């Protein structure tokens, strides 16, 4: 009794809840950075460890402390439900990634550090230095089996 | 009929039997019938709900 099963959960717009759009440029909120996709140890045919919402520094190193947080990685290559880039990049390659920096209202429950740990309260200060709002007022949702 | 080589009997017919068959479940028609074309099938599921709004 085993069947091949796949699932999808979320979307892109649940991380960047709101965004200020400038007349002059529609792309002054973001910043493109050069990021390593596959580590230098894992063989070529292995899934990437990054995910949408990982805090990264300017130098492309995924954030590990509140002192290095610079932006949120929201590139379209790591959105949920893609899974088709396995084995396309050999280990150690460096690929551009789109970060989101300025003029955003960002969810907190999905922002995480390198290892998946939640964002520290003192890490919010660094992210709001760029002029962004970290909001927790998310209604959420409740599926079958629940009352209401 | 004949008994042995010289005598006779009286032949009185045949007996027969056949066991029971339980059709209870099939009678009340639970299962729908869908004639496929191959030996693999796929089923998809989707579900949505609601939330607990707060005040500001």
UniProtKB/TrEMBL annotation, chain A:
Recorded hits in Pfam families, A to Z, give: Phage_DEC_PhiTE (PF26074)
Q: Which InterPro entries match?
A: DEC (IPR058875)
Q: What is this protein called?
A: Head stabilization/decoration protein
Automatic annotation (TrEMBL), chain B:
Q: Which domain of life is it from?
A: Viruses
Name of protein: Putative major head protein
**What is the protein's species of origin?**
Pectobacterium phage phiTE
What portion of the full-length protein is represented by this chain? 1 to 56 of 332
């Amino acid at each position: 009794a085993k069947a091949h099963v796949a699932t999808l959960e979320g979307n892109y717009s649940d991380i960047v809840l709101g965004r200020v759009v400038a007349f002059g440029d529609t792309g002054w909120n973001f910043k493109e950075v050069d990021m390593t996709f596959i580590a230098d140890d894992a063989d070529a045919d292995s899934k990437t460890t990054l995910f949408a919402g990982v805090l990264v520094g300017e130098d492309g190193t995924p954030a590990t402390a509140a002192a290095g947080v610079f932006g949120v990685l929201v590139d379209r290559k790591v959105l949920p439900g893609v899974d088709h880039y396995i084995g396309v990049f050999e280990p150690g390659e460096k690929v551009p990634m789109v970060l989101a920096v300025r003029g955003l209202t960002l969810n907190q429950l999905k922002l995480k550090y390198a290892d998946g740990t939640a964002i520290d309260a003192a890490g919010i200060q660094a992210l709001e230095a760029q002029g962004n709002q970290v909001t927790d007022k998310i209604v959420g949702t409740q599926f079958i089996g629940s009352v209401l | 009929m004949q008994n042995g080589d010289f005598q006779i009997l009286d032949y009185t017919g045949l007996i027969s039997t056949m066991p029971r068959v339980d059709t209870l479940l099939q009678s009340m028609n639970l299962f729908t019938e869908h004639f496929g074309r191959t030996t693999v099938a796929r089923i998809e599921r989707l579900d949505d709900g609601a939330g607990d709004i707060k005040a500001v």
